[PDB]
Structures are given as structure tokens and as C-alpha cells.
Amino acid sequence: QLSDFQRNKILRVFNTFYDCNHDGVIEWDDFELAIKKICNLHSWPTDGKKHNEARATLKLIWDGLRKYADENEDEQVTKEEWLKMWAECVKSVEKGESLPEWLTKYMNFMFDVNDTSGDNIIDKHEYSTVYMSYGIPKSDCDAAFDTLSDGGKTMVTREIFARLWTEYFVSNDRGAKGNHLFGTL
Ligand SMILES: [Ca+2]
Ligand SMILES: [Ca+2]
Ligand SMILES: [Gd]
């Protein structure tokens, strides 16, 4: 139903980007730690514009995740419920059926987190800043970003990041360039 290459890809985003308190289950608590994190890193005025965008955007993502994975409606999402969902999404993308709104919010949230500069491109400096903070070493944020940017001849616009994003979550092709989007496997 789901190859290990995809499973393993799919749990990294869980254990490394969602379970921000490292307790086995995604819940809103994890989203607060993340909000705090990005708030600080990018030095946002604590209740100003970006911080509040980030918080009301992550309320939607939780609510989306909540609604599309929480089988028992217990306000927490286990890896089982997390894989169980992502399988549907893979079918979905493969079978044409596009992703639910909250996915496109998460996807673009990650982009906007990176693109502090505002120019709708992610230069290398922006990529290393974010993903190092997540505890990926710098010999990867630099390693991977060259896989993602093809040496730097390709600008990494919002569209490019979407393609890469997609390949990360659903491509079973263990040679696909987007498989390095969250670092190196
Ligand atoms: Ca649950
Ligand atoms: Ca930029
Ligand atoms: Gd958690």
C-alpha cells in the first residue's frame, strides 16, 4: 500500500517537523513550540504581523490535519493515523485527485518560512537558516540544496518548490531530486 521509501520519507516530516516535542503524537502543543521557534529565528515582533499570520495559518493546518487523520477524534495524531492518511494522498496525487486545502497551506507555509527575503525565491542562505534550526547539520542544508537547485543554475521559485515538495511526499523514484528537500536520506 505504501513503499518503505515513502513511509520513511513520510515519518521524517513527522518526527522532525511535526512532533516538535518528540512524544510520538502530533497535537496542537507541537504547533506552539514551532510557532515559538520560527518567531525567534526570524526575530518577529511577538504579536505583530508575521507572528500572527504564522499562528492563524498553523491553526488551519492543525485543523486540516485534525480533520484528515485523527480517526478517533482525540485531538492527537499518531504515526499510524499519519501513515494511514498519507497513503490516501499518494493515491490521490497519482490518481489525479488533488490535495485538500490544508496541504497547500502547509506546503506554502514552509516556503514562506524559508523566503524571509520576500523575493519569492529561496537562495541558499534562506534554506540553511531554516533547516539547520530544525537540527539538520550544515553538511546537508548545503549538500541537499545543490541537489535541489542543480548547482544554482535553477532559481527555486514557489512553483519549483511545489514540484520538489510533491516528489518528496509521493515519488517512489528513489532518484527523484525532491527526495532531498528535507535533507539527505
Ligand atoms: Ca488519534
Ligand atoms: Ca528569498
Ligand atoms: Gd507532539
Side-chain angles (χ1 to χ4, degrees):
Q1 42 256 317
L2 218 48
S3 88
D4 294 37
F5 185 52
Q6 306 166 296
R7 291 181 61 253
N8 302 127
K9 274 194 291 192
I10 274 166
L11 295 196
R12 293 176 90 270
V13 198
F14 175 110
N15 302 289
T16 321
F17 294 86
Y18 273 82
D19 192 6
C20 269
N21 57 20
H22 307 301
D23 67 4
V25 303
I26 313 181
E27 55 195 336
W28 169 257
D29 285 80
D30 320 334
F31 287 87
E32 272 286 18
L33 294 114
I35 282 150
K36 293 164 194 281
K37 189 146 156 172
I38 306 164
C39 200
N40 291 337
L41 196 92
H42 295 358
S43 319
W44 292 336
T46 289
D47 277 333
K49 302 91 186 65
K50 306 307 203 66
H51 177 98
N52 292 339
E53 292 179 11
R55 187 175 41 215
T57 288
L58 288 174
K59 283 188 200 110
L60 292 189
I61 297 173
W62 174 227
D63 288 340
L65 175 54
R66 216 163 43 67
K67 196 223 285 155
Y68 279 91
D70 197 17
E71 193 265 321
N72 50 316
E73 193 192 311
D74 68 342
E75 258 82 286
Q76 74 195 22
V77 180
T78 67
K79 284 158 202 160
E80 302 88 29
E81 310 177 26
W82 175 257
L83 297 163
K84 201 202 171 193
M85 170 192 73
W86 268 112
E88 299 282 15
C89 320
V90 161
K91 311 217 275 205
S92 217
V93 167
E94 288 167 350
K95 305 182 106 63
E97 255 84 23
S98 92
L99 302 171
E101 167 191 344
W102 72 275
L103 247 13
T104 327
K105 298 206 87 295
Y106 176 42
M107 149 158 50
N108 277 292
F109 177 86
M110 260 288 179
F111 181 93
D112 295 331
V113 156
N114 279 291
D115 185 47
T116 74
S117 81
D119 53 335
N120 262 255
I121 295 172
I122 305 170
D123 56 74
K124 171 97 128 195
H125 322 302
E126 287 166 343
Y127 184 82
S128 12
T129 290
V130 174
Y131 290 88
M132 273 170 37
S133 107
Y134 264 100
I136 291 311
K138 202 183 174 315
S139 47
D140 279 318
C141 301
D142 285 45
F145 186 72
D146 260 70
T147 298
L148 298 169
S149 57
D150 192 4
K153 80 163 190 67
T154 351
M155 303 242 98
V156 187
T157 56
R158 203 175 281 281
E159 330 192 19
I160 298 295
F161 185 87
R163 297 191 181 93
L164 292 155
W165 178 272
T166 302
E167 301 172 13
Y168 182 95
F169 288 112
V170 311
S171 174
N172 207 35
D173 194 280
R174 320 218 2 169
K177 150 191 312 171
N179 301 310
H180 285 99
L181 180 73
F182 299 107
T184 315
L185 288 134

